[PDB]
Amino acid sequence: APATIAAGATGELTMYYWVPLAYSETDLTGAVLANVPQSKQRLKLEFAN
């Protein structure tokens, strides 16, 4: 992200987030079995405005 965006300028930003279910790549505590039900998962995201 640009440190500053001057008057009249347009800045381009990139951000990444990891939403964990499993604790880590080797510890599956918290992981979700989704093969087993047609019932949908919901990942709700509210962005800046």
């Binding site: 087993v36 039900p37 047609q38 019932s39």
Partner: protein, 83 residues
């Protein structure tokens, strides 16, 4: 699992599936392996097998020599008391 009537979960993944490939084959490995370099009987180390002394005891050799020689001075005679 929950099934809900009247919207029931299809009774299978059916026959409309897209077989994507026939790449299923693992070709068996056939091989001949030879590790045959001349071996020489010995390795050099700084030290192997020693149980080094942490402290030694004190150690010694021995000698004596000489003869029996002497210069002497005696007590004077005295009067005998009793008996």
């Amino acid at each position: 699992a929950l099934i809900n009537p009247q919207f029931p979960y299809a009774g299978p993944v059916p026959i409309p599936g897209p077989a994507p490939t026939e790449t299923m084959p693992l070709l068996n490995y056939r091989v001949e392996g030879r590790i045959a370099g001349i071996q020489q009987a010995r390795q050099f180390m700084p030290f192997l097998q020693g149980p080094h002394r942490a402290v030694a005891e004190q150690t010694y050799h021995a000698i004596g020599t000489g003869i029996q020689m002497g210069q002497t001075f005696n007590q004077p005679l005295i009067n005998t008391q009793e008996g």
